[PDB]
Amino acid sequence: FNKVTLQKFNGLTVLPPLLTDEMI
Amino acid sequence: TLEILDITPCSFGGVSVITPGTNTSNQVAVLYQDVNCTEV
Ligand SMILES: *[C@@H]1O[C@H](CO)[C@@H](O)[C@H](O)[C@H]1NC(C)=O
């Protein structure tokens, strides 16, 4: 998790995943 | 005034329903996407 490099203005929406990370 | 300000777009998003099928019941729930709904 500490080795990755993961905001909205106009119509862009980032839906959250159905399964959260602690669930996985 | 030579103050500095910030521009954040005011809230938008899709509305979406929760329906259990019409032949089961008629009540639905409604979801408002990314709204800190103190307000409607
Ligand atoms: C909604 O806004 C209030 C105002 O600061 C804040 O205290 C609260 O934590 C916010 N809720 C969420 C889920 O962001």
Distance B11 CA to ligand 1 centre (A): 14
The three-state secondary structure class of B31 is strand
| B10 φ, ψ (degrees, to nearest 5) | -75, 165
Tokens of B15: 């509305």
Instruction: Give the list of residues 6+ apart from residue A7 with CB closer than 8 angstroms, or none.
Output: none
Q: Is A2 on the interface with B (CB under 8 A)?
A: no
- Chain B positions touching A11 (Cβ under 8 A) are 12
The residue of chain A with its CA nearest to that of B8 is A9
Distance B26 CA to ligand 1 centre (A): 32
Residue B34 CA to its chain's centroid (Å): 6
Short-list B25, B32, B29, CA closest to B17: B29
What stretch of H or E contains B16? strand B15-18
Q: What is the resolution of this structure in A?
A: 3.5
